[PDB]
């Protein structure tokens, strides 16, 4: 049972919220933790998707909330009344289950009771096997998947999967005079919906890369909304989609973002964190030894002066006062959110929501070169004897062309080129010390699209020094573009270390002149 939400919806008495995930995203209840006694004060059922973060105000009656449910759509809590405009309410008790969940109501899910549910799919036809609903969690994994194709009853559409939103705060404690609803989805589409006209005002897709936590703590007081790109940049893309300021100044991707309405405390992956202001200036960075998973900062007494709860990526927590170090100990394997746990009107109680299942509360001008006398003497010699240099260099070039053509013709004669219409390329690699070496011939057809059918490899060695099992073998059909490793086991027989060359000839089966060849100097034996 992994969880997503953690939020302190205070001022009731100490009412803390926790959104757990059930079988298929269900909140059986969005449980209230009651962190110093671990009981349920007010249960919050009827939510089909994992919510992450609530929302409060000063004029609210403290029981309703705002559950941004990662799943189908959003369900704003209004005392067990999710009422959004046209596509966001989507039957908060699972609509894609209970059209077909009625056959799995005799007991819990186990493969014993599933094989008696043969009539239960067809003794009650609430839908004609609609593709949106017939296969959600609990059914037979094999036998009813052949009836999906022949039925194919059509579906509907809705808003895409969300993570975070942005809403209004001024006319909030009536839940109907709201104007702007800018929510962040997974496809980085912060759709701006308005209930005054049932319209879509804008959509924020300028990152077009998914945010982790979209709004730095659900809003900023200066409305400099902080979207976090999954590339290594954090944006200052303002509220109601104004013009972007973008600070790319991060060494890697940002992990976790909260704010205390003065600073932007982001994570990193280059083993640090960065505290940016609303404009983009780095106020203060903090060095940590490992990567960060999730941070936060507590309430402000002065302008943001309390402790930071910063977990790590090797189960460690690390607490700080920005300049002075407090803790390194190993509680959470992973974590979702770190918020208040304050009860009895004390200063500060800290909560910690791990991913094993527990709810932990534990307190502890240029570089232009320079030329010496040698250069001016050499240039003077060149200026006084340029003709002889030109003539002798041309003579040397003629002789070099002659000798290169000579050696090229001699190689063509002996066919010693491992690269040579008739396209091929072969080179032999030797591996291993000891009396037994692994000799792998990497052979390759280098042509646009033409295979080579009849080829064969023949080895030439000294039969008194090396014992090759198969010194001659056919090669597979060489497909243009693939390196075929064809390996053999050479074995040194000389009791004394003797290194002798081994030739390899690749040749057709109807011809006697090798198509190409290769050489390998076998290393020393290191025998026994």
């Amino acid at each position: 049972a992994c969880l997503a939400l953690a939020d302190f919806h205070g001022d009731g008495e100490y009412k803390l919220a926790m959104g757990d995930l059930g079988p298929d995203g269900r909140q059986p209840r969005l449980k209230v933790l009651k962190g110093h006694t671990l009981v349920s004060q007010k249960p919050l059922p009827d939510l089909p998707a994992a919510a992450v973060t609530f929302l409060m105000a000063s004029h609210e009656p403290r029981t309703p909330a705002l559950a941004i449910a990662s799943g189908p759509c959003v369900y704003v809590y209004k005392n067990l009344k999710p009422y959004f405009k046209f596509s966001l309410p989507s039957l908060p008790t699972n609509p894609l289950e209970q059209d077909l969940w009625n056959q799995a109501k005799e007991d819990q899910i186990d493969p014993l009771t599933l094989k008696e549910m043969l009539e239960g799919i067809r003794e009650k036809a609430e839908v004609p096997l609609s593709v949106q609903s017939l296969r959600f969690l609990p059914l037979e994994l094999s036998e009813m998947e052949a009836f999906v194709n022949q039925h194919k009853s059509k579906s509907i559409r809705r808003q895409t999967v969300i993570t975070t939103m942005t809403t209004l705060k001024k006319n909030l404690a009536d839940e109907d005079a709201v104007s702007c609803l800018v929510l962040g989805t997974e496809n980085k589409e912060l759709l701006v919906l308005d209930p005054e006209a049932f319209t879509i005002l804008a959509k924020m897709s300028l990152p077009s890369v998914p945010a982790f936590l979209e709004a730095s703590g659900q809003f900023d007081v200066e409305f400099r909304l902080a979207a976090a790109c999954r590339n290594g940049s954090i944006y200052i893309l303002r509220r109601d989609s104004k013009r972007p300021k973008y600070c790319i100044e991060l060494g890697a991707q940002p992990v976790g973002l909260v704010g205390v309405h003065k600073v932007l405390v982001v994570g990193s992956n280059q083993d640090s964190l960065h505290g940016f202001t609303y404009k983009g200036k780095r106020l203060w960075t903090v060095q940590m030894p490992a990567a960060i998973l999730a941070m936060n900062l507590l309430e402000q007494h002065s302008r943001g002066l309390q402790a930071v709860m910063a977990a790590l990526a090797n189960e460690e927590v690390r607490i700080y006062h920005d300049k002075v170090l407090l803790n390194v100990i190993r509680t959470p394997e992973a974590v979702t959110s770190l918020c208040f746990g304050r009860y009895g009107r004390e200063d500060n109680t800290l909560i910690m929501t791990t991913l094993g299942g527990g709810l932990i509360i534990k307190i502890l001008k240029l570089n232009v070169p320079r030329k010496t006398r040698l250069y001016v003497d050499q240039t003077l010699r060149e200026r006084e004897a340029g003709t002889a240099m030109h003539r002798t260099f041309q003579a040397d070039l003629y002789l070099l062309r002659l000798r290169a053509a000579r050696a090229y013709v001699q190689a063509l004669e002996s066919s010693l080129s491992p690269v040579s219409r008739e396209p091929l390329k072969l080179h032999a690699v030797v591996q291993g010390l000891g009396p037994t070496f692994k000799l792998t011939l990497h052979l390759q057809n280098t042509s646009t699209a033409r295979p080579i059918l009849g080829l064969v490899v023949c080895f030439l060695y000294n039969e008194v020094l090396y014992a090759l099992p198969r010194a001659f073998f056919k090669v597979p059909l060489l497909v243009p573009g693939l390196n075929y490793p064809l390996e053999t086991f050479v074995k040194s027989l000389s009791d004394k270390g003797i290194s002798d060359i081994i030739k390899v000839l690749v040749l057709r089966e109807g011809q006697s002149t090798p198509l190409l060849s290769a050489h390998i100097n076998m290393p020393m034996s290191e025998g026994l």
């Binding site: 799943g71 894609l96 959600f136 969690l137 982790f212 232009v368 240039t379």
Partner: protein, 388 residues
């Protein structure tokens, strides 16, 4: 289905790629497949990593699950196009289009595919369509590329101007239009657009290079030298930058400090004919005549259909006690040169110095038919005239 929902979306956003990947092997097992998001994370996430094979496989599975979805076919054709197969990408984009006839992405991708397939009529028409559905910058860039590859800049200037007309903050569009202005006679609007680019990005290497080139062309080598100092450390080893810097230092009579930069650029690119031509020219000006021939012959072997190369090879040659080779090189040049009278004047000088005075008049008349700014080619024009 997908009970976790964001669990296997938490390690991925932070790019953990361990818990998020290992969790898949567990989440999938519990749900016995049919989640549709675990597979999706493997796909687009796989494509974000270097791998574009498992991405193609999982997009194939997503298309199999929803046979009548255009986005899945688009993604499969895109995974094809990320590999080398463009014909199959076209044939999958077609099916993706016969399910949705109102999106610009299919038409833009068909354009960029037909571009790689050298089918320019279909690519051009498809990209015109992609504009008419929804105008995007990349479609404009691909259309300009089509009109440059196929034909002339006369067709690309209109497209790039219309492109920069709206959304004028894209550095690529501004810089490419400025480059295409350089490619033609206009040097003023080229400077305008390159400065427009440099306002946004001051350290733009691709724009600083062309701005410094234009500056060098109209004298004032120190301004171009400062422009190059702006970007010298960003690209410390780039043959074009050092070639332009060597030409800067050759402008203001720093011949040794120009040979240095030009030889450094030649070492980092031994197959670049411009640096070889520049080395030959500077070694001609330095009166070395042994190296000049070598570098000019190299630049000839790299771009043989030029007229000035053979002129300079003949020019040096004349000083290397080989006049017959200079004769045949000048013949090659005059045959291969059309709009540069310097070759004709230099061949007339060679002829008149050979004691002929007969064909020197022929080369003088060829030059005067060809024709005008050089201070020292003016005097030799009139001195070989009056003395003939």
């Amino acid at each position: 289905l997908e009970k976790q929902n964001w669990l296997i979306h938490l390690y991925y956003i932070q790019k953990d790629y361990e818990a998020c990947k290992a969790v898949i092997k567990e989440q999938l097992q519990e749900t016995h497949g049919l989640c549709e998001y675990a597979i999706y994370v493997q796909a687009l996430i796989f494509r974000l990593e270097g791998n574009i094979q498992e991405s193609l496989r999982l997009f194939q599975m997503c298309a199999f699950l929803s046979p009548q979805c255009a986005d899945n076919l688009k993604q499969v054709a895109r995974s094809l196009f990320l590999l080398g197969k463009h014909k199959a990408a076209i044939e999958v984009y077609n099916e993706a289009a016969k399910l949705n006839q109102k999106d610009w992405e299919i038409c833009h991708n068909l354009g960029v595919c037909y571009i790689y397939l050298k089918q320019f009529d279909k690519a051009q028409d498809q990209l015109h369509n992609a504009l008419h559905l929804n105008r995007h910058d990349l479609t404009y860039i691909m259309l300009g590329k089509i009109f440059l590859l196929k034909g002339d800049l006369d067709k690309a200037i209109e497209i790039y101007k219309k492109a920069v007309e709206f959304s004028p903050e894209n550095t690529e569009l501004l810089t490419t239009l400025g480059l295409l202005y350089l490619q033609l006679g206009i040097y003023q609007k080229a400077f305008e657009h390159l400065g427009n680019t440099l306002t946004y990005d001051p350290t733009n290497y691709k724009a600083i290079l062309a701005a410094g080139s234009m500056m060098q062309t109209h004298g004032d080598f120190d301004v171009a030298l400062t422009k190059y100092k702006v970007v010298a450390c960003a690209v410390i080893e780039s043959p074009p930058l050092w070639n332009n810097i060597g030409m800067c230092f050759f402008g203001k009579k720093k011949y040794v400090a120009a040979i240095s930069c030009l030889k450094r650029a030649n070492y980092l690119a031994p197959l670049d004919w411009k640096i070889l031509y520049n080395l030959g020219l500077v070694h001609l000006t330095m009166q070395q005549y042994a190296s000049a021939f070598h570098f000019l012959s190299a630049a000839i072997n790299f771009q043989p259909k030029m007229g000035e190369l053979y002129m300079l090879l003949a020019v040096a040659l004349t000083n290397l006690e080989d006049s017959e080779n200079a004769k045949r090189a000048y013949e090659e040049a005059v045959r291969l040169d059309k709009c540069n009278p310097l070759v004709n004047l230099n061949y007339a000088v060679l002829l008149y110095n050979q004691g002929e005075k007969r064909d020197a008049l022929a080369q003088y008349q060829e030059m005067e038919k060809k024709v005008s700014s050089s201070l020292e080619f003016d005097p030799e024009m009139v001195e070989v005239a009056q003395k003939l």
